[model samples]
Target: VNSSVEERGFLTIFEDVSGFGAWHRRWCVLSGNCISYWTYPDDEKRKNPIGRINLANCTSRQIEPANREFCARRNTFELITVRPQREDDRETLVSQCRDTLCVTKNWLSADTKEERDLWMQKLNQVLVDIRLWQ
Candidate 1:
């Protein structure tokens, strides 16, 4: 495994294929600062990500329970919607992304390099312990 890869996972997400509300299935992976996905699972091995969202520049929120969707809004106000395959996965994925965003926000707010480093260490350990990084 590559040590530089922070987090990785397989998730079934939805993407808009057309303006007419066509939602398609996508296989996604969370690595480094982005969440990238492919239209087909086999495509993930060769092609570049068909879509990607930078977590550092976005904030995440869980949508209404009926929708079973989690959304990430970018700095430019564009929204990315993710739908997990299972109801249980919904909360886990959304909470993990939100926690990552919160840690980033706190680190950015730190007034000193020492504080930032401390936050990084703690965040890394927590993520590892929780199997967020594999």
Candidate 2:
């Protein structure tokens, strides 16, 4: 038997629009289960691999909407397991780990100069909101 969807992975909303939204599906199969980060151009539908995320230090909250929006420019998103993957049971592994690890990890952390800049931008937004409330 297969485990519940809750045990498989996590889905997060990256962007949303009038009728649809984009999503980033993340899962922790094992200590080394990898996740790739990617995005399609504003006018494209298919994703292009650009970076990766290391599952070692990954936190579940790391795949939040703020993070996804920072990486991809889309309207909105929601993560849903289109197909659940099985464990060692080949017949049950239904989900497709389409995204790559390196690409996903790249966007995961603000480890690089470009990523750091992006994080700053998001942090600034928080500051602006705080000022408005004050």
Candidate 3:
């Protein structure tokens, strides 16, 4: 896997808790196939990620009216809700993740029969893994 970073920025994200509600400012980075974040603004010096979510097994949706509201979901049905500090930041972050999800979906809908079959096989394997965990 490539160790090179893809994207990085600071944003405020709402922690999804049942009763408790809070928004935290975090330095988030998209590296490899995962989006990892740090509670501190200085993320480079951190030893471990405070939170990390895999892009491959996730889906994202944007909420309106409050233009900053963005939500993502994991295969296991875990939800993460966030809001960028700036409007432009919200557009950039949402587009980046949404594009990733679109690309993965398009890849699965391959034109060639063999490629489509292979993609389907791998996709089913991922579904099986998620089902096993659930």
Q: What is the lDDT of candidate 3?
A: 0.41
Off by more than 4 A, model 3:
1-5, 41-43, 60-134
Q: Residue 18 error for model 2, in Å?
A: 36
Candidate 3 lDDT over residue span 60-118, tens digit each: 43111122223332111122333323333322222233532321111111224453344
**Candidate 1 off by > 4 Å:** 1-10, 60-134
Report the candidate with higher lDDT, 2 versus 3. Answer: 3
Q: What do the candidate models score in CA lDDT, each in turn?
A: 0.39, 0.30, 0.41
Q: Give residue 3's lDDT in candidate 2 (0 to 100).
A: 26
- Model 1 lDDT tens row, 1-134: 43444433343333333333223445655566565778666887899988675543433331111122333321111223333233333223222344223211110212334533443443344334434544
Q: Between prediction 1 and prediction 2, which has the larger lDDT?
A: 1
Distance from true position, residue 81, model 3, in Å? 11
User: TM per model?
Assistant: 0.39, 0.20, 0.40
Candidate 3: the clashing residue pairs are none
Q: What are the C-alpha RMSDs, in order, of all predicted structures? A: 15.7, 16.9, 15.1
lDDT at position 107, candidate 1 = 9
